[PDB]
Design a protein around this nucleic acid. Structure first.
Ligand code: CL
Length: 276
DNA sequence: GCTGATGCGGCGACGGATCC
DNA sequence: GGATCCGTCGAGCGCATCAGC
């Protein structure tokens, strides 16, 4: 079935208007995404904060266009030190964060270019490009050990300020989160191990899945489609991209959007509206 | 400098069997 | 004998390195 994201709900359960718009996009090659006009789409979305994943771009290679975003002028970038051309994340913000850090505890020795932490007045934002389990699950054990390290890391942060985690978490949590659950149960992104890791992330930190919280029974809502086999035109997809929130932020939650129509990557943007 | 091949990382279509 | 299950295979894209010029 095709999918039509419902209209933007811009007011919280208590009637407060949204004051903060966060957009997250796994761009699958930041320089190619720009050439495919992804920044034109960002401009129309006008987020306060833009998180980008799979940029595949070290900071010296950022296109000039990123220097022409006056409403997203505070920019933080990360890319892995060995595997240049892979992973890579970015966080761009209208207002300057109070603190920024990289990685999940030892980035200075294992510069992975997967995680950015930014602390604002009212919340801490984490964006992540979570390690894929690999074709044939060759890196699944690593993914499980990464999941555990990440959970512990985030539990520490959320003990201080409320947490917003966004990005490509690279698992479809439940069967409703992908088009072909039965055929993919031995594939990266839908193994029992990865699904369990996501469930434990929600329980241990604790975090809520903003979109599923608002739309608990809505199927065919995906954020990724393989480039092969015309999967996007058929909406044969996976929901890999999330906004997870501390429970205490749920009264600020206005809406969590899937921007299905925005092209330029094999993932689409997702957008969060918060009343802070 | 530039192009294009190759390497590497990030699953749905289809054929055949099985279920009742 | 239509629906479902299951395993196999052939498959887009981006960016790095490498060869060639
Ligand atoms: Cl990558």
């Amino acid at each position: 079935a095709l999918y039509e994201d419902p209209p933007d709900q811009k007011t919280s359960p208590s009637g407060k208007p949204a004051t903060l718009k966060i957009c997250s996009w796994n761009v699958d090659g930041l320089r190619a995404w720009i050439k495919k006009k992804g920044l034109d789409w960002v401009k129309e979305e006008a987020p306060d904060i833009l998180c980008l994943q799979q940029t595949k771009c070290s900071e010296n290679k950022l296109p000039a266009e990123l220097q022409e975003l006056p409403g997203l002028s505070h920019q933080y970038w990360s890319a892995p030190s060995d595997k240049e051309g892979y992973s890579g994340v970015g966080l761009l913000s209208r207002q300057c964060p109070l603190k920024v850090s990289y990685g999940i505890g030892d980035e200075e020795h294992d510069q992975e270019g997967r995680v950015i932490v930014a602390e604002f007045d009212s919340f801490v934002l984490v964006t992540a490009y979570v390690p894929n389990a690999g074709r044939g699950l060759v890196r699944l054990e690593y993914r499980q050990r990464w999941d555990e390290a990440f959970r512990k890391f985030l539990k520490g942060l959320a003990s201080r300020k409320p947490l917003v985690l966004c990005g490509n978490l690279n698992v479809a949590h439940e069967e409703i989160d992908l088009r072909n659950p039965k055929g993919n149960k031995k594939n990266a992104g839908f193994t029992p191990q990865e699904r369990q890791g996501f469930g434990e992330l929600l329980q241990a930190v604790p975090l809520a899945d903003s979109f599923r919280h608002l739309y608990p029974n809505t199927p065919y809502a995906y954020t990724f489609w393989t480039y092969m086999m015309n999967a996007r035109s058929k909406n044969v997809g996976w929901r890999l991209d999330y906004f997870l929130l501390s429970h205490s932020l749920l009264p600020a939650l206005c809406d969590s959007k899937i921007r299905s129509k925005a092209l330029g990557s094999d993932h689409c943007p997702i957008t969060l509206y918060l009343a802070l």
